[PDB]
Amino acid sequence: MNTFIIFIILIPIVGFALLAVNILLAVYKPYNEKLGTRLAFNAAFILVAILFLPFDLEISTLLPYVMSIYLVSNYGFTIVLLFLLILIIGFVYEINTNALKINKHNKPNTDSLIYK
Amino acid sequence: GVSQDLPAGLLDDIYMWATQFGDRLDEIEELLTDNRIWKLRTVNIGTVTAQDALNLGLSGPMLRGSGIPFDIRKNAPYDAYDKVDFDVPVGMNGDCYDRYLIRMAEFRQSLRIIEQCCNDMPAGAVKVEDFKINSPPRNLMKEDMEALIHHFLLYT
Amino acid sequence: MIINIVEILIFLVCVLFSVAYLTVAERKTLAYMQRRLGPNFVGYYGLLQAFADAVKLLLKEIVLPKESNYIILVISPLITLITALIGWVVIPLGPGITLGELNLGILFSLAIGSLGVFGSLLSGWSSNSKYSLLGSIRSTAQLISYELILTSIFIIIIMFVSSLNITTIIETQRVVWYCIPLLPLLLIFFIASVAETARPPFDLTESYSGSPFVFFFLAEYSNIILISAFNGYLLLGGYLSFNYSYLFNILFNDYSYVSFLFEGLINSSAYAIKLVFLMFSFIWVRAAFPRFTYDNLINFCWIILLPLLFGIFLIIPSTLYIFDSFPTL
Amino acid sequence: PSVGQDLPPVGGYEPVQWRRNLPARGFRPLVYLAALCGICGYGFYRALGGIQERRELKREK
Amino acid sequence: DNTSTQYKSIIDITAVDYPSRENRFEVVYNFLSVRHNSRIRLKTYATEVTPVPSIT
Amino acid sequence: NIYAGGSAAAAPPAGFRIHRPATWEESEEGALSKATKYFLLAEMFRGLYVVLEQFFRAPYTIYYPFEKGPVSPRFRGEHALRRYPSGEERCIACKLCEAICPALAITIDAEERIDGSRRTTKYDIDMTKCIYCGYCQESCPVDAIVETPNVEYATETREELLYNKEKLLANGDKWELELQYALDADAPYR
Amino acid sequence: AIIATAFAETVKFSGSKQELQKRTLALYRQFLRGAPTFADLYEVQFSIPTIRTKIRQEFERHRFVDDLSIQNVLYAKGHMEYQECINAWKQQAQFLKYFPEEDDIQGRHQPSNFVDKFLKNRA
Amino acid sequence: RIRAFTINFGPQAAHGVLRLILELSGEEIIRSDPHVGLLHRGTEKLIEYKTYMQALPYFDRLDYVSMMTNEQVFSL
Amino acid sequence: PSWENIKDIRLDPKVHVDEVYEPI
Ligand SMILES: CCCCCCCCCCCCCCCCCC(=O)OC[C@H](COP(=O)(O)OCCN)OC(=O)CCCCCCCCCCCCCCCCC
Ligand SMILES: CCCCCCCCCCCC(=O)OC[C@H](COP(=O)(O)OCC[N+](C)(C)C)OC(=O)CCCCCCCCCCC
Ligand SMILES: CCCCCCCCCCCC(=O)OC[C@H](COP(=O)(O)OCC[N+](C)(C)C)OC(=O)CCCCCCCCCCC
Ligand code: SF4
Ligand code: SF4
């Protein structure tokens, strides 16, 4: 009965109304010419969304700390410092390995012109 | 030659245009030349070496993008490009960025041609002299028998 | 019960009008930046053109291809419409003026903003073509990659307040705004906000008809004004302009409905002027810049911005530590 | 003969601008960095002062 | 390849038919030496059925 | 001297040798100065401020059916067969406009009429295969067909767009006051 | 263009009649292997043995050609045709150039005799 | 066998009437193939049946953003 | 120093020849 839930139920009423208005209102009239295996992908594509999740789980692990920041003063501060640095080391692993690059397969072919 | 003579007051008008086009171009130059997004998008893109720019038969801004000093209006000149003084931009790395920079400079050089050609314009005929390859003027072919014959034959 | 439904349809009529006129505003200022007129053909000075376009596109033929889930393809518009619009509750137009005053408002605003990825990715599975998939892959990869640093900037700001309530942050910002100390964070948050909508500074995948188009269209600009609202409350002052106590002690003598009317006018005028300058800056950065390759974008987020953000994670609790300044609940 | 044509001036036109007019504008970068650090440090002054006041207010309540 | 010639750049190659000849087409080749600033042309012939060898 | 063979006076110019690119240590900018421009986006902001300046200036747009753009009298649009003073058709059927037309748009049949005067029985232009070179107007000794500066005659059928003798005589009727203005400024230059 | 297309062949001219017969039979095998992907690719009305009888018929047009150079030019044109058909470059409207006979009956009154050729003066 | 995925930059950033078959391995272009001829009209056959003055507009038809240069090369 | 007070160039003494000399 608050003004919070009329919103939750009323935004769909907005949408249901408008796509009704078009489906009820516009021409359908389709045909064949109007209508209409698998590819390979590089490793960094799947890598960005797989390694996305362990950083996201860290960001919501900071979320209990920054609400409790006064109560654990000088002590939970250092525990969080150690937590953050332990994960910064895995991040410097990740950017030292050049993991998230897609790198181009053709060079200028650097190898020189020798003879005989 | 040329189809017909200039209209009566156009030479005074191309000057008035050029005076402001000089700054209308620097303005376009500023949000691209040292834009870091425009830079990163074209720095090592489209690199052509100077030896295979010849083998592919490339010319103009793509051959001068690669370091080779060659353009026809300086090397094998024609149509009063001898009489007009200008310089030529030539890139060094074969990329899209130097092919961009030499166009942004050929703008400037063309404007230099325009003001030198408005200053140094002579009088005289604008078509070739004889009426056996292009037409007599309509003042003449309506009273001259020879010129009516030539006008009738150059068009049929 | 008359009171809250009249309040909510007042809020709905305001925000769903203002997302329509944002479209008319972007065309006109994109035109004047490009030294031409905007639309003046359809209103007295060009207005209700978004109405003209919506009137016509609700008359447009809907094509459901051979390739497609039909149900998935037309309710991905609605799930992106609904969660692009649900996040409009928690923003305050004044102290305690929201459609729901809940003590965890940033957690809600942060949970709804993660629900908005699906209607990209899911609608790639609509019209299953091999190029209709990996473009959606690049889209959703950029989307999640920049809502990471969005969430990060949020949690950096909550280190100063230690409360997930939103009007508590704005009342906390009365002593100083949060952009004035943390101005690099305003720059970082602006560019992450531009990425999170996939605006055409940071667009790659652009580079239907009818209802699945107008729902995506409305969701795009509702996301524009919603992340602008997020910037307005946690980084600029939310509804805060100046003190205005001396002006009131000149004008008024006691609490009346005209005094509360005047105070609400001042508060939401400050909030709206922040939001309007912010939307102008969105269109202004759209006008001036080319776009990104996917590799420039992923290199930008994961290799440049995120290590700097780790440095910010270390530096800001440490200065809250050096001077014994921890925020209390 | 030549009568009635478009001709240039007796002394010509005066020269137009064909050089790049891109003058280096702005302060030195260390001026902008010093101003940035000054603005940010003053904001941290006010923010940390306000947090300490809010803590004393919490003690009162 | 000769240092005197150095006709590096291919410019334009094409054919012209003269139907009154036994070998109907003649195939012309245009070359530019950007070093010595000089052009040259090379003309061979071809019937409709018989080939020319390719300089690709 | 005497040159080699494979050798003209086109030697390399004085200074065609590059200078070696500078390392990071032989640079006048400090690392702090250089990276302040890096992290504070300096020339991005410069190019931002350019278009911000352009927000505050006058647009170029003219309002088309209320305001037309440039006209020179030389300009070419639709066709017109003019008439003499005291009304005579001017087209003496000399076939020159047909002989010169680069896209073969003109077709004419010509017969001697009752007066013994030489006129066209049939004059015709296909405006779908016309290219507006103006050669038909340049060629005519009598100056019988001209180009009026009308471009606003866009049609809906192809049959409407095939102009016989009668449509072109009606055009040369209608636009004659205007073609006076065009040929008062063009006729010396022709 | 140093890399070439997938179903490319460096054009090469045979001094022997029999090695060109080898290449011709290999080409016929390539065509008839590719008849089902032609039927799927161009969305045709009919079924695959009509593509196969057209390939055989287009080869029995050119069986008694003697001169080796004319058979070389014929083989090169045929391989270019195969490369266009297999790579899905030709569209259905030009794939069905090969079947003018099959799409429809063009109407009545097919002139066979001298007189029904004469009544419409060959139209 | 790195199998390549094929698309076109079809006619409908292609500047109009170009077709460009690209063969990709993920992000990379391992093979390109421009198809050309969707604008080809046989102007070069048509010039042979016009006089030189009638053949003059065939030249500013082609490369239609730089007209006077196209006129100039034929006139020279 | 103004765009009001800028000189016109249409009012100018222009080049004028009696007769052009071009050798053949
Ligand atoms: C010494 C300074 C202080 C020291 C402390 C350390 C940092 C504190 C300050 C932090 C603030 C950071 C702001 C964001 C940093 C951006 C850094 C950057 O330039 O990215 C570089 C990146 C590519 O890097 P790279 O390949 O090396 O090439 C660079 C060319 N030199 O380039 C890219 O990938 C793309 C660059 C994108 C830039 C954003 C483009 C669109 C957004 C424009 C927003 C403009 C906002 C203006 C709004 C005005 C509102 C009134
Ligand atoms: C709303 C809050 C955001 C405010 C924007 C951010 C703060 C401003 C920092 C950059 C500007 C600055 O102060 O730069 C100061 C520098 C000074 O350079 P100089 O000494 O003249 O160079 C001399 C070089 N010569 C010798 C070649 C000439 O450039 C300028 O004056 C240029 C004008 C800047 C206008 C400011 C833009 C906003 C316009 C509205 C006026 C307020
Ligand atoms: C890691 C970076 C270290 C930087 C060190 C800088 C030294 C400055 C010392 C000035 C001391 C002072 O003036 O502080 C005074 C202020 C306000 O205090 P108050 O409420 O009035 O005191 C009340 C005392 N009672 C309760 C006993 C009455 O307090 C501060 O917190 C602000 C410090 C100045 C800005 C520091 C900026 C740090 C930004 C770091 C982001 C990287
Ligand atoms: S319009 Fe002119 S060129 Fe054409 S037939 Fe008449 S007089 Fe001759
Ligand atoms: S304008 Fe050119 S194409 Fe048209 S009718 Fe005249 S000569 Fe022919």
Side-chain angles (χ1 to χ4, degrees), chain G residues 67-78:
Chain G
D67 301 329
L68 172 71
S69 42
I70 296 182
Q71 293 170 352
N72 286 317
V73 317
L74 199 48
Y75 178 70
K77 299 286 184 64

PDB file of all heavy atoms in Angstrom, chain G residues 67-78:
ATOM      1  N   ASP G  67      39.200 -28.486 -82.058  1.00  0.00           N
ATOM      2  CA  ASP G  67      40.406 -27.677 -81.879  1.00  0.00           C
ATOM      3  C   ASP G  67      40.734 -27.490 -80.404  1.00  0.00           C
ATOM      4  O   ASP G  67      39.866 -27.120 -79.607  1.00  0.00           O
ATOM      5  CB  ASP G  67      40.251 -26.327 -82.568  1.00  0.00           C
ATOM      6  CG  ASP G  67      39.994 -26.464 -84.049  1.00  0.00           C
ATOM      7  OD1 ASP G  67      40.488 -27.446 -84.648  1.00  0.00           O
ATOM      8  OD2 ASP G  67      39.312 -25.586 -84.618  1.00  0.00           O
ATOM      9  N   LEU G  68      41.994 -27.758 -80.057  1.00  0.00           N
ATOM     10  CA  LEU G  68      42.412 -27.877 -78.666  1.00  0.00           C
ATOM     11  C   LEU G  68      42.362 -26.541 -77.937  1.00  0.00           C
ATOM     12  O   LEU G  68      42.012 -26.492 -76.752  1.00  0.00           O
ATOM     13  CB  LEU G  68      43.823 -28.460 -78.619  1.00  0.00           C
ATOM     14  CG  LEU G  68      44.556 -28.510 -77.283  1.00  0.00           C
ATOM     15  CD1 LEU G  68      43.933 -29.533 -76.388  1.00  0.00           C
ATOM     16  CD2 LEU G  68      46.031 -28.793 -77.475  1.00  0.00           C
ATOM     17  N   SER G  69      42.694 -25.450 -78.634  1.00  0.00           N
ATOM     18  CA  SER G  69      42.631 -24.114 -78.049  1.00  0.00           C
ATOM     19  C   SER G  69      41.207 -23.702 -77.743  1.00  0.00           C
ATOM     20  O   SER G  69      40.968 -23.141 -76.673  1.00  0.00           O
ATOM     21  CB  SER G  69      43.297 -23.085 -78.964  1.00  0.00           C
ATOM     22  OG  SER G  69      42.958 -23.290 -80.316  1.00  0.00           O
ATOM     23  N   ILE G  70      40.255 -24.008 -78.639  1.00  0.00           N
ATOM     24  CA  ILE G  70      38.851 -23.713 -78.369  1.00  0.00           C
ATOM     25  C   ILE G  70      38.320 -24.551 -77.207  1.00  0.00           C
ATOM     26  O   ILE G  70      37.506 -24.079 -76.393  1.00  0.00           O
ATOM     27  CB  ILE G  70      38.052 -23.920 -79.664  1.00  0.00           C
ATOM     28  CG1 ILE G  70      38.493 -22.934 -80.744  1.00  0.00           C
ATOM     29  CG2 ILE G  70      36.563 -23.762 -79.457  1.00  0.00           C
ATOM     30  CD1 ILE G  70      37.710 -23.028 -82.049  1.00  0.00           C
ATOM     31  N   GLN G  71      38.840 -25.760 -77.041  1.00  0.00           N
ATOM     32  CA  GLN G  71      38.457 -26.529 -75.869  1.00  0.00           C
ATOM     33  C   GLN G  71      39.116 -25.992 -74.601  1.00  0.00           C
ATOM     34  O   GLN G  71      38.543 -26.111 -73.513  1.00  0.00           O
ATOM     35  CB  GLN G  71      38.803 -27.992 -76.073  1.00  0.00           C
ATOM     36  CG  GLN G  71      38.023 -28.717 -77.122  1.00  0.00           C
ATOM     37  CD  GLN G  71      38.618 -30.076 -77.384  1.00  0.00           C
ATOM     38  OE1 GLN G  71      39.694 -30.398 -76.880  1.00  0.00           O
ATOM     39  NE2 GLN G  71      37.917 -30.891 -78.156  1.00  0.00           N
ATOM     40  N   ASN G  72      40.284 -25.357 -74.724  1.00  0.00           N
ATOM     41  CA  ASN G  72      40.904 -24.715 -73.567  1.00  0.00           C
ATOM     42  C   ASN G  72      40.112 -23.497 -73.123  1.00  0.00           C
ATOM     43  O   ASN G  72      39.914 -23.281 -71.917  1.00  0.00           O
ATOM     44  CB  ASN G  72      42.332 -24.293 -73.895  1.00  0.00           C
ATOM     45  CG  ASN G  72      43.281 -25.450 -73.951  1.00  0.00           C
ATOM     46  OD1 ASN G  72      43.235 -26.337 -73.110  1.00  0.00           O
ATOM     47  ND2 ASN G  72      44.160 -25.447 -74.940  1.00  0.00           N
ATOM     48  N   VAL G  73      39.655 -22.687 -74.086  1.00  0.00           N
ATOM     49  CA  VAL G  73      38.887 -21.495 -73.739  1.00  0.00           C
ATOM     50  C   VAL G  73      37.540 -21.916 -73.153  1.00  0.00           C
ATOM     51  O   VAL G  73      37.046 -21.306 -72.198  1.00  0.00           O
ATOM     52  CB  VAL G  73      38.728 -20.534 -74.947  1.00  0.00           C
ATOM     53  CG1 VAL G  73      39.965 -20.355 -75.731  1.00  0.00           C
ATOM     54  CG2 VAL G  73      37.691 -20.893 -75.858  1.00  0.00           C
ATOM     55  N   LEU G  74      37.011 -23.058 -73.617  1.00  0.00           N
ATOM     56  CA  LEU G  74      35.753 -23.588 -73.121  1.00  0.00           C
ATOM     57  C   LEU G  74      35.907 -24.098 -71.701  1.00  0.00           C
ATOM     58  O   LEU G  74      35.036 -23.874 -70.851  1.00  0.00           O
ATOM     59  CB  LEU G  74      35.325 -24.697 -74.067  1.00  0.00           C
ATOM     60  CG  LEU G  74      33.931 -25.260 -74.195  1.00  0.00           C
ATOM     61  CD1 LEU G  74      32.919 -24.158 -74.314  1.00  0.00           C
ATOM     62  CD2 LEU G  74      33.984 -26.066 -75.457  1.00  0.00           C
ATOM     63  N   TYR G  75      37.030 -24.760 -71.420  1.00  0.00           N
ATOM     64  CA  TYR G  75      37.277 -25.276 -70.080  1.00  0.00           C
ATOM     65  C   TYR G  75      37.490 -24.151 -69.079  1.00  0.00           C
ATOM     66  O   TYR G  75      37.036 -24.244 -67.930  1.00  0.00           O
ATOM     67  CB  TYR G  75      38.483 -26.213 -70.088  1.00  0.00           C
ATOM     68  CG  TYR G  75      38.808 -26.728 -68.710  1.00  0.00           C
ATOM     69  CD1 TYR G  75      37.976 -27.636 -68.079  1.00  0.00           C
ATOM     70  CD2 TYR G  75      39.930 -26.281 -68.026  1.00  0.00           C
ATOM     71  CE1 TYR G  75      38.259 -28.091 -66.816  1.00  0.00           C
ATOM     72  CE2 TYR G  75      40.215 -26.730 -66.762  1.00  0.00           C
ATOM     73  CZ  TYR G  75      39.379 -27.634 -66.166  1.00  0.00           C
ATOM     74  OH  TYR G  75      39.668 -28.086 -64.907  1.00  0.00           O
ATOM     75  N   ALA G  76      38.173 -23.079 -69.495  1.00  0.00           N
ATOM     76  CA  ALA G  76      38.371 -21.943 -68.600  1.00  0.00           C
ATOM     77  C   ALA G  76      37.055 -21.233 -68.288  1.00  0.00           C
ATOM     78  O   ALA G  76      36.805 -20.881 -67.124  1.00  0.00           O
ATOM     79  CB  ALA G  76      39.381 -20.975 -69.202  1.00  0.00           C
ATOM     80  N   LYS G  77      36.197 -21.034 -69.306  1.00  0.00           N
ATOM     81  CA  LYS G  77      34.871 -20.461 -69.062  1.00  0.00           C
ATOM     82  C   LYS G  77      34.045 -21.341 -68.129  1.00  0.00           C
ATOM     83  O   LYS G  77      33.323 -20.835 -67.257  1.00  0.00           O
ATOM     84  CB  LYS G  77      34.105 -20.260 -70.372  1.00  0.00           C
ATOM     85  CG  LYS G  77      34.717 -19.323 -71.399  1.00  0.00           C
ATOM     86  CD  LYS G  77      34.619 -17.864 -71.058  1.00  0.00           C
ATOM     87  CE  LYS G  77      35.172 -17.035 -72.202  1.00  0.00           C
ATOM     88  NZ  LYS G  77      34.361 -17.195 -73.430  1.00  0.00           N
ATOM     89  N   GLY G  78      34.168 -22.662 -68.272  1.00  0.00           N
ATOM     90  CA  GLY G  78      33.404 -23.560 -67.420  1.00  0.00           C
ATOM     91  C   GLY G  78      33.868 -23.572 -65.978  1.00  0.00           C
ATOM     92  O   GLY G  78      33.052 -23.647 -65.055  1.00  0.00           O
TER      93      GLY G  78
END
